[PDB]
Design goal:
- This protein has 102 residues and is of the alpha+beta class.
- It has a single domain (1-102), classed as Double Stranded RNA Binding Domain (2-Layer Sandwich).
- Helix content is 42%, strand content 29%.
- The chain contains three helices and four strands, in the order H-E-E-E-E-H-H.
- The protein has helices at 6-20, 70-88, 93-101, and strands at 27-29, 32-43, 46-54, 62-67.
- Strands 1-2-3-4 form a four-stranded antiparallel β-sheet.
- Helix 1 packs across helix 2 and helix 1 (6-20) runs parallel beside helix 3 (93-101).
- 31% of the residues are buried.
- It is classed as lipid binding protein.
- The entry lists the keywords ALF, endotoxin.
- It forms a monomeric assembly.
Length: 102
Amino acid sequence: EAYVQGWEAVAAAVASKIVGLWRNEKTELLGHECKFTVKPYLKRFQVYYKGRMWCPGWTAIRGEASTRSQSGVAGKTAKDFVRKAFQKGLISQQEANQWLSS
């Protein structure tokens, strides 16, 4: 369901597609080539999962995120990159819907 924040829901769907279509350290957004990667660290008595992704070819923007969840950080890194491109004016609603379709 998507109400009021329709654009925020579309960005979340794009981040989920990035994790489902992510390779060892590379991905593709809207048909363009991009680089998505993850890197967990360790604390005196804890384990954190960090990640960062960007598109070296489509434009000049990046987005990263960190948390305790392993897969959650992947969707979080893709969501931060989509939010930076959405605030500037690159990821549109129709373009994100076409990428999610096929």
